[PDB]
Amino acid sequence: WTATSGSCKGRCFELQEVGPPDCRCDNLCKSYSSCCHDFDELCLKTARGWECTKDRCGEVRNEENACHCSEDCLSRGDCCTNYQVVCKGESHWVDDDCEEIKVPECPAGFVRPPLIIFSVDGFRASYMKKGSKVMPNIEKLRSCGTHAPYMRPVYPTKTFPNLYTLATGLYPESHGIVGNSMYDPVFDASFHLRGREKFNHRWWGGQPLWITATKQGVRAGTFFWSVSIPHERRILTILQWLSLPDNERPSVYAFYSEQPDFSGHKYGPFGPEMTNPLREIDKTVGQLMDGLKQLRLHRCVNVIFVGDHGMEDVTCDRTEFLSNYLTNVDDITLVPGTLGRIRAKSINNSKYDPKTIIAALTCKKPDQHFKPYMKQHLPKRLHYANNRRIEDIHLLVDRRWHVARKPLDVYKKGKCFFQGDHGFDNKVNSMQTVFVGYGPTFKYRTKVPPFENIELYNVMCDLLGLKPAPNNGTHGSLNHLLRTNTFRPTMPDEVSRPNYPGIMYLQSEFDLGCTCDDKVENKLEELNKRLHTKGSTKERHLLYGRPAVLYRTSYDILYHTDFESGYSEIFLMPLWTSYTISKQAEVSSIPEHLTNCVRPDVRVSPGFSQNCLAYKNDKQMSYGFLFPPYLSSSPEAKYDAFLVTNMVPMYPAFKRVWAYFQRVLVKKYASERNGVNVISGPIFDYNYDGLRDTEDEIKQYVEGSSIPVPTHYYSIITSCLDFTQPADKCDGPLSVSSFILPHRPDNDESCNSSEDESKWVEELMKMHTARVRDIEHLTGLDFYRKTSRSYSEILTLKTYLHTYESE
Ligand SMILES: *[C@@H]1O[C@H](CO)[C@@H](O[C@@H]2O[C@H](CO)[C@@H](O[C@@H]3O[C@H](CO[C@H]4O[C@H](CO)[C@@H](O)[C@H](O[C@H]5O[C@H](CO)[C@@H](O)[C@H](O)[C@@H]5O[C@H]5O[C@H](CO)[C@@H](O)[C@H](O)[C@@H]5O)[C@@H]4O)[C@@H](O)[C@H](O[C@H]4O[C@H](CO)[C@@H](O)[C@H](O)[C@@H]4O[C@H]4O[C@H](CO)[C@@H](O)[C@H](O)[C@@H]4O)[C@@H]3O)[C@H](O)[C@H]2NC(C)=O)[C@H](O)[C@H]1NC(C)=O
Ligand SMILES: CC(C)(C)c1cc(Cl)c(C#N)cc1OCc1n[nH]c2ncccc12
Ligand SMILES: [Ca+2]
Ligand SMILES: [Ca+2]
Ligand SMILES: [Cl-]
Ligand code: NA
Ligand code: NA
Ligand SMILES: [Zn+2]
Numbered sequence: 001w002t003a004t005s006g007s008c009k010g011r012c013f014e015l016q017e018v019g020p021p022d023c024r025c026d027n028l029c030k031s032y033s034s035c036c037h038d039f040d041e042l043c044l045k046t047a048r049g050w051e052c053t054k055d056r057c058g059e060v061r062n063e064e065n066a067c068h069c070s071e072d073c074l075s076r077g078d079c080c081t082n083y084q085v086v087c088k089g090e091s092h093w094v095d096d097d098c099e100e101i102k103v104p105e106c107p108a109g110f111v112r113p114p115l116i117i118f119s120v121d122g123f124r125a126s127y128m129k130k131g132s133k134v135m136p137n138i139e140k141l142r143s144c145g146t147h148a149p150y151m152r153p154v155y156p157t158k159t160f161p162n163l164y165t166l167a168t169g170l171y172p173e174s175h176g177i178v179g180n181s182m183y184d185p186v187f188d189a190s191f192h193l194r195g196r197e198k199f200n201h202r203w204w205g206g207q208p209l210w211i212t213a214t215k216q217g218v219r220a221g222t223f224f225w226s227v228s229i230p231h232e233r234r235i236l237t238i239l240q241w242l243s244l245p246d247n248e249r250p251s252v253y254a255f256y257s258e259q260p261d262f263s264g265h266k267y268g269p270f271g272p273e274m275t276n277p278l279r280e281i282d283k284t285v286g287q288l289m290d291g292l293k294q295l296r297l298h299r300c301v302n303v304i305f306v307g308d309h310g311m312e313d314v315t316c317d318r319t320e321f322l323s324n325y326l327t328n329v330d331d332i333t334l335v336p337g338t339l340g341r342i343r344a345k346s347i348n349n350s351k352y353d354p355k356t357i358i359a360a361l362t363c364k365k366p367d368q369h370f371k372p373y374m375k376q377h378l379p380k381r382l383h384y385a386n387n388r389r390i391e392d393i394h395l396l397v398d399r400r401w402h403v404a405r406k407p408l409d410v411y412k413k414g415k416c417f418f419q420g421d422h423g424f425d426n427k428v429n430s431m432q433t434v435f436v437g438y439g440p441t442f443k444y445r446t447k448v449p450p451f452e453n454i455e456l457y458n459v460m461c462d463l464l465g466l467k468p469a470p471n472n473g474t475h476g477s478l479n480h481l482l483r484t485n486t487f488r489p490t491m492p493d494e495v496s497r498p499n500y501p502g503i504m505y506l507q508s509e510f511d512l513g514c515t516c517d518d519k520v521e522n523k524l525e526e527l528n529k530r531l532h533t534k535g536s537t538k539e540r541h542l543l544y545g546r547p548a549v550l551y552r553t554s555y556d557i558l559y560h561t562d563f564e565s566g567y568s569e570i571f572l573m574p575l576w577t578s579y580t581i582s583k584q585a586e587v588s589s590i591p592e593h594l595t596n597c598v599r600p601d602v603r604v605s606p607g608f609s610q611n612c613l614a615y616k617n618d619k620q621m622s623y624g625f626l627f628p629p630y631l632s633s634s635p636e637a638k639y640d641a642f643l644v645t646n647m648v649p650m651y652p653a654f655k656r657v658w659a660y661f662q663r664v665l666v667k668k669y670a671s672e673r674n675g676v677n678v679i680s681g682p683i684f685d686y687n688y689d690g691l692r693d694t695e696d697e698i699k700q701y702v703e704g705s706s707i708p709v710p711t712h713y714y715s716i717i718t719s720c721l722d723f724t725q726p727a728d729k730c731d732g733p734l735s736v737s738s739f740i741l742p743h744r745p746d747n748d749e750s751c752n753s754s755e756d757e758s759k760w761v762e763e764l765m766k767m768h769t770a771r772v773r774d775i776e777h778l779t780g781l782d783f784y785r786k787t788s789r790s791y792s793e794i795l796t797l798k799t800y801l802h803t804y805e806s807e
Contacts, residue, residue, distance in 0.1 A: 002034040012043035013237045015219070015250070030226035032199070050232040050287075052080045057087035067236060074294065077243025081235065081291040093289035093298060094137045098144035104440040106300035109246040113440050114297070115463050116238065117254045117304045118288070119166070120281060121159060122261025122422065124269055124310030125150035125432040127278065134275055135282040137289060138436070141305055144445060145438030146481050152452045152801070153309045155382045156339050156423045157431040159261070160193075162308040162453065167208035167223065169457030169471025171383040171690075176205035178389045181335055183343070185388060207469035209460055213252050216466050221253035231257060231284050239291040252464055255288070257281055261422075264311040268419035269430065302441050302463050306456070307433030309422045312399055314338070316416030320369050320397075323406040326360050332405070338423030340370060340395025340403045354393055361395070363751040369398040371749070376688040379768050380712065380740045380778070381801065382426070383472075385688040399428050427769075429805045441485050448481055451799065462487055474773055477795040489791065492782055494548035498557045498566060501603040503533075510606045513613035516597035518639055529636075535559040540728055542578045543677045544718070545786025549575070551692070558603060560640040563627035569608040570695055572707050573648050576681045576781060577626035580728050581670040587663065590629050594642060598623075601645040609644050610707050618703035620745060624650040626680050628662035648682055649702050649709050651745040657764060658713065658741075660757035665765075666717075673719035673735070675727030682710035683740060683778045692780040714740045714775045716783065733789065737802035740770040740778065772798040 001021050008025035018024055023036035025043060047064045048056075056069035066080075069087060073079035084090040104113045128147075132139050154165045154172055158180045161172040172178045182191040182203075191198050210220040221241055225234050238253050259277040267273040285305070292298040322340075323329045331349060335341035344352040354374070361372040373394045375385040384390060397403050402421070404410050424431055432450075441463055458475040461468040462485045468475065476489040542564045549555065554569040563579035598612050615623050625646050632638035640646070650658060670676050684693035686700075700709040716738045720730030741764070747753035752760045772783055776798065784794045 002032075004035065004037050006036050008036045008039045008042045012039075013222075013240070015221070015241075015248075027222045027226055027229065028224065030228055031224075044229070044233065046230075050080060050236075052083045052086040054086060066232075077240050077295075078236070079294060081239070081287040081294070084294050085290065090293075092286065093293045094140055094286055098140065098445075100444040101299045101440045104300050105296075107296055110300060111246070112251060112465060113463075114242065114250070114301045115252045115304070115460060116288070116301055117166075117252075117306065117460070118257075118285065119163065119254060120257045120305070120307050120434070121259065122264045122309065122311045122420075123281075123307035123434050124260075124264075124430065125307075125434055126310075127260070128434055130270070131275070131278045134279050137282045137285040138305065141285070141303065141438045142436045145303075145436055146442040146444075146446045146448060147437075148435045148448050148450050150432035150450050151306070151435040152450060153307075153426050153431060153433055154453060155384055155426040157309040157426050157428075158423050159308050164204065164206075164208070165453055166306065166308070166456055167210070168206035169454055169468060169473045170206045171454065171472050173383055173385060173387040173390065174206060174472065176203055176387065176389065178384075178387050179335065179339075179341070182389045206471070209252065209457060212461060212466055212469055213464060218252065218464055218466060219248075219250040221250045223254040223256075225256050227258065231255075232287065235284060235287050235291060238288070239295065242292075242295060242297065252460075255284075257284065261308075261311065264420040265418050266420070268313050269311040271419065300440065302437065302439030304456075304460070305434065305436040305438075306453075307435075310431045310433050311420045311422050312338075312424065312428070312430040313419065314400055314402060314421040315419055316402075316410055318369070318400055319402045319404050319407075319410055321404055321407055322361075325364055326357065328357075329405060332357070334403070334405045335391070336404045336409065337402055338397050338421050340372075340393075340397060341391040342393035342395070343391040357393060362748050368751070369401040370395045370403050373749075376711075377742055377744070377749070379770075380685075380690065380774055381768070381770050383690055383774075386690065396425060397423075399424050399430060427801070427803045427805060437481060441483055442481060443483050446481075448478075449796070449800075451478060451796075452801075455799070458487070474795050474799050476792050477799045479792040480796065486792070489795070491785060491791065492548065492550055494782075495551055496549040496553050496555065498546075498549075498555050501556050501558075503602045505600070505602045505605060507600060507602070510600040510609065512598070512600060512606065512609060512611035512644060513616065514598035514600065514611070514644060516599045516642060517593040518597065518599060518642075525636075529561075532561040533559055535564070537561055538564055541580050541677075543580060543728060544784045546578075547576050547679070548782040548785055549780065550782055551780040556604065558601070558645060560627075560643075561637040562631070562633050562640060563646075565626070565646065567604065567645050569604075571682070571684075572608060572610050574626055574646070574681055575779065576679050577646065578677065578679045579627055579631070580675065580677045581631055581666055582675045582726060582728065583670055585631060585633075585667065585670060587630050587667050588632060588638075591635075591638075594629075594638070597639075597642040598644050598647060599639065599642050601643045604645055610647050610702075611644075611705065614702045614705040614707055615649070620651065621649050621702050621709070622652050622655060623647050624655055624658050628666065630663045631666065648713075649707055651743065653745055653747050654713075654741075654743055656747065656753075656757060657761050660761045661715070661765065664757075665762065669717060669719075670727075673717075673727065674723045674725070675719060677718045677727055679714075679716040679718075679783065681714055681779065683712040683714055683775070684708060685711050685778055690774070690777050692778055710743050712740050712742050712778070714738065714770070714779070716772055716775060731788070733793065734784075734787070734797055736772060736797055736800055738770045738772055738775060739765050739768050740774060741765065741768050766804040769802050769804065771801050 003021040004023045006023040011025040014025050024034045029035035045066045052069040061070040153162045160177050164177045168175050213220045263277045455473045455478050458468050458473040479486040556567045558565045565574040565577040568575050629641035698708040718736050719727040721733040721735040750760045
């Protein structure tokens with residue numbers, strides 16, 4: 001209940017929320033059906049429109065007008081935004097030449113440059129270029145300020161997940177807004193676009209920027225605007241708040257436009273009808289900047305122009321129906337569209353089986369436009385699993401397509417309405433969105449590389465002098481956007497120092513069940529192999545320092561001619577293995593006599609070694625090697641590759657992937673990149689939280705042993721960004737690509753896996769591309785500790801994702 005017979009007189013767009021049943025005069029009142037009776041009359045005035053004209057100049061103040069052209073309007077803070085242009089001979093902001101803002105130029109009583117976030121729904125990255133002729137205000141922001149060619153959204157590429165990521169720095173799995181629609185089984189409650197449950201605070205995890213600000217003494221404007229408040233009134237309200245007294249005035253503000261998303265759904269991303277919404281958004285930007293200029297704030301305020309996601313061409317005819325695959329289609333609930341989420345219609349049905357649903361949806365039609373996954377098997381770059389609101393079964397839908405339960409869902413919701421949609425995999429080009437920063441704290445005329453929207457919360461906090469709440473950004477990775485206010489991070493401290501074992505065991509102390517045909521015998525070459533086991537080639541194979549171990553554990557550094565490793569006594573395998581392959585390196589085969597060779601490592605105790613008998617007796621599990629025997633520098637060096645300390649457990653199906661990567665792709669990348677340094681290793685993430693498992697979280701071991709089975713294998717492949725220099729003699733910036741491959745007992749994910757590895761393996765590896773940072777979270781390791789580069793630059797490198805999309 002609301003007692004709507006109080007009044008909004010002098011309270012219009014009040015910042016503090018008053019509690020029921022007292023009637024409200026803030027934005028949200030409309031969305032809650034709780035505004036006072038006179039809210040429209042007093043707070044939503046429209047009389048005479050939004051622009052001054054010559055005949056209104058110097059008018060007598062009429063309080064009914066939407067905005068004012070009277071002499072007193074500047075001091076009242078309520079002129080139409082074009083007032084000084086029409087009445088005082090001033091230029092529009094867009095007509096002024098760009099001049100570098102070297103320092104904030106703020107009115108007295110301004111303690112810090114304010115931040116205004118201008119968010120645009122569905123603003124696809126390529127609009128900046130393709131629409132530039134109709135968006136002069138936006139183009140001036142972009143060209144004069146700091147811009148990226150695009151910004152990567154989070155998955156799913158929907159509105160609420162991305163806007164709340166912008167506000168928190170968190171992945172959807174952590175903040176809780178995992179889609180525009182959700183069921184929470186602990187609450188037994190549903191979240192929808194329509195209606196009232198979406199306002200309950202239990203949906204919204206983390207700490208959004210407005211709360212971070214408020215807790216630290218910085219006042220915030222509203223972030224959520226009711227759909228019926230027109231854009232001109234949103235801008236006027238921001239400008240009015242900016243004229244408040246110092247003690248009352250917010251420092252952070254947000255504007256939101258429902259466009260161009262609204263029209264893009266109807267007409268497609270480049271429909272001819274899209275030109276007008278882009279014109280209109282630009283006009284609104286022009287109003288803001290003109291308004292700021294009137295207040296003498298245009299060289300004081302930092303402005304962020306940012307989108308939530310892009311838009312793709314999607315029509316009703318490109319719909320896959322689960323009714324064409326499953327017999328049991330009425331025993332499931334599907335969350336449909338540009339992603340699929342499946343759960344049981346009834347939790348009383350004990351004949352519901354996820355395995356049989358997945359199998360009925362796997363590779364059933366030759367041009368099938370979706371792929372089913374258990375959520376823990378989704379590419380780790382998506383970070384889309386660790387939330388009870390994300391259903392166990394997930395469908396990744398091909399760009400340009402939808403998935404639905406039955407045809408009737410599409411025509412009874414029989415002809416097609418829509419031509420655009422979004423929600424797809426966040427690496428897809430059409431889903432990419434925009435970032436522009438303009439103001440005293442941003443750089444002048446500066447282009448920066450594409451980056452992820454999870455990074456922006458930290459920067460917004462830096463722009464406002466706030467300490468960010470714990471989040472998924474990597475604070476410092478965006479310092480290159482900023483003139484000043486940089487955050488100066490330090491490297492994390494190493495927690496565990498390594499042991500450096502020498503030769504401590506005789507061959508006969510081992511009873512591992514391993515064989516090797518290696519009884520094959522010189523003081524020239526005897527001292528030389530000794531130097532290699534003490535680390536004489538380490539400078540070649542460990543280019544960026546050894547990774548630091550950031551948790552408590554017991555591990556050994558092991559040196560060899562061709563590779564170096566950090567060997568875990570707890571997990572009985574390397575945490576990491578590092579090696580460099582020059583452009584000139586040669587690929588050889590595993591000699592016939594060494595096919596089943598595994599050799600005891602006399603530096604490492606039997607008790608902390610793997611054994612071959614375990615693999616013999618585990619009928620499902622085989623083994624691979626981290627440093628590949630195929631890339632040995634010489635016949636004699638190859639024996640090192642067969643050490644028991646270089647062995648890792650591998651399903652035969654996965655060994656097909658791994659063998660092709662090692663035998664073919666590494667050498668290909670070395671030829672293309674002019675050498676590469678490779679770091680490879682295992683990952684254990686049995687609870688799919690994106691974070692390194694402790695020993696007691698491991699769910700699977702090689703049968704009859706304490707050898708833990710990795711969930712994933714990673715590689716980090718580094719070279720010189722200037723590819724005219726070899727990877728091992730690089731003077732400047734680095735270039736990286738990485739992956740986190742799921743360690744699966746089948747290749748069901750790859751529908752073409754019966755074919756030669758040259759037709760499917762690289763495609764798999766591209767799907768599972770990763771950031772170095774993702775591998776850091778999953779391993780508790782810290783890479784690139786010893787380079788010549790600035791730490792901020794290295795942080796940027798660690799956040800890079802190699803996407804494999806063209807332009
Ligand atoms: C991305 O960045 C984020 C933020 O940095 C990272 O998330 C953090 O990860 C930490 C480790 O997983 C985690 O720390 C835990 O916090 C517990 C207290 O949690 C509450 O308080 C915080 C602080 O205000 C709050 O933010 C939390 O909010 C979550 O939950 C509510 C709903 O309940 C949601 O509104 C919200 O969206 C959020 O949900 C997300 O996180 C939770 C986990 O907290 C997930 O379950 C959800 O699916 C969702 O992803 C909480 O309200 C604390 O109690 C934990 O302590 C246990 O573990 C320690 C280890 O040191 C152990 O010593 C203790 O014994 C203790 O164990 C006891 O509980 C166990 C489980 O009940 C039990 O088995 C034991 O036997 C013990 O009884 C733990 O420290 C931190 O909360 C989150 N923060 C957020 C915001 O998500 C994320 O990791 C980053 N991602 C990547 C990939 O890097
Ligand atoms: C989390 C939240 C959605 C409040 C949000 C976050 C940020 Cl960071 C911004 C910014 N800039 C805007 C935000 O909301 C804008 C908004 N208003 N009205 C809407 N209606 C439908 C959909 C979105 C909106
Ligand atoms: Ca949106
Ligand atoms: Ca884990
Ligand atoms: Cl109302
Ligand atoms: Na086996
Ligand atoms: Na297959
Ligand atoms: Zn949309």
